């Protein structure tokens, strides 16, 4: 029947309203919030679902409800708390983190969202050296893409916040103290050479100014296990580089530390895209390693499991509600029981199996 179809949608567009009662219900993300809060960070296959269905709807789940609860009770005076979303492949870690990014975005937090951190440690076609420190290297294209997305999300706060120091981009170009933070972002996009340095200024400024009570800061890094791992980038001597050497990686490692206050850090682990890690590695120590684990502790691990019986029915009815499951036998009880076995209630596998059907 369609009894879970009633449970397959909720009218509470605002993430604050959500609670345990709303579990297993899909809340539509407003169209403006998709083009502002989420210009990046949504999974690639989910983005295909948003285009075809014409609407983004994120199932409310207990893991993402627990996280939103901690964010509501955040003690800004106390140091920032690192929340680590760890789970098996396809369980929904990225979209559980995107749920937290929506809650903070609607309360007027300053979103510092790194959509994927594996992209910064592999397949780089332009790798320059840094003037600030000659040991470090600069990734112009990787930094330029992030800045354009960071600009879109936080466009409102780019005029209020203002630099507290003078930054000399070139001999002929410098940023006077007091100018809006938007100017730092504008120069980075204008001159790609400084793009990897504009990012460092942005991260440094926000971290320092957040403690002054002007704004809250959500450092949401998905794929954080890349920072303390290995790279597949080679130097001019054909010798592999290390994560510390890279400029973007080094700046971020500071933001994920609990030595500041005025915000919260939400981290996620992703074995997908990871370098030199097994396919069946999901636990925090296996993916972070000894260096990554020690860096982040004390952290709060939040397990993202597979769909429970209530959530699987809600997802099954959501696909049926949009006419996605076009096979004649999919709506039947023998189809549903089959799809439960093959997918095993895994969110990603269920989306893949239903995609072909």
């Amino acid at each position: 029947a369609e009894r879970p179809r009633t449970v397959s949608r909720t009218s509470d567009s605002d993430p604050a309203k959500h609670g345990e009662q709303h579990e297993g219900q899909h809340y539509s993300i407003p169209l403006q919030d998709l083009k502002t809060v989420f210009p990046h960070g949504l999974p690639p296959r989910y983005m295909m679902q948003v285009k075809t269905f014409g609407e983004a709807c994120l199932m409310v789940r207990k893991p993402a409800l627990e996280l939103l609860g901690y964010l509501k009770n955040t003690n800004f005076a106390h140091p920032a708390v690192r929340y680590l979303l760890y789970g098996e492949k396809g369980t929904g870690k990225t979209l559980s983190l995107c749920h937290a990014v929506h809650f903070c975005a609607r309360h007027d937090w300053l979103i510092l969202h790194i959509p994927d951190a594996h992209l910064w440690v592999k397949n780089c076609r332009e790798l320059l050296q840094s003037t600030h420190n000659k040991q470090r290297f600069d990734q112009p294209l990787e930094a330029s893409t992030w800045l354009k997305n960071f600009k879109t999300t936080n466009e409102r706060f780019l005029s209020q916040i203002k630099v507290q120091e003078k930054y000399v981009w070139n001999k002929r170009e410098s940023t006077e103290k007091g100018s809006p933070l938007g100017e730092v972002v504008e120069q980075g996009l204008t001159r790609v050479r400084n793009a990897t340095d504009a990012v460092g200024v942005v991260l440094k400024e926000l971290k320092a100014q957040s403690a002054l009570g002007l704004f809250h800061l959500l450092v949401a890094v998905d794929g954080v296990n890349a920072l303390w791992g290995r790279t597949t980038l080679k130097k001019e001597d054909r010798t592999l580089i290390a994560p510390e050497e890279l400029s973007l990686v080094h700046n971020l490692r500071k933001m994920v530390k609990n030595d500041w206050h005025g915000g919260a850090i939400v981290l996620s682990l992703s074995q997908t895209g990871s370098l030199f890690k097994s396919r069946t590695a999901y636990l925090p120590h296996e993916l972070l390693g000894k260096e990554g684990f020690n860096a982040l502790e004390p952290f709060l691990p939040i397990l993202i499991p597979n769909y429970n019986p209530k959530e699987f029915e809600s997802s099954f009815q959501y696909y049926l509600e949009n006419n996605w499951l076009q096979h004649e036998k999919a709506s039947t009880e023998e189809g549903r029981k089959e799809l439960r076995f093959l997918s095993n209630c895994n969110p990603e596998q269920l989306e893949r199996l239903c995609a072909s059907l």
Binding site: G69, Y70, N73, N75, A77, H78, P79, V81, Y86, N258, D259, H261, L283, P284, H285, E286, K290, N294, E297, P298, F299, L300, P301, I302, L303
Partner: protein, 80 residues
């Protein structure tokens, strides 16, 4: 060094520093006068957190052992 050791020793480790640093920042935010190192690391909250980290490092890491670590962090960090 720490890397050489086969059995994790929380005492004089990266964990103890990270825990002590957090507790120092927590008492400072409370506006309390700077406390002693032994005072911060003698509390029961820190005792349990030591036991949980050691289990993850020595006994083994699993969802059950990670759940125990989650509770200790909540008590140590005064999270609801």
């Amino acid at each position: 060094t720490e890397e050489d050791m086969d059995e994790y020793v929380w005492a004089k480790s990266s964990s103890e520093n990270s825990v002590l640093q957090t507790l120092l920042q927590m008492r400072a935010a409370e506006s309390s006068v700077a406390p002693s190192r032994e005072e911060l690391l003698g509390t029961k909250e820190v005792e349990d957190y030591q036991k949980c980290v050691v289990r993850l490092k020595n006994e083994g890491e699993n969802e059950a052992s990670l759940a125990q670590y989650k509770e200790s962090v909540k008590r140590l960090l005064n999270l609801a």
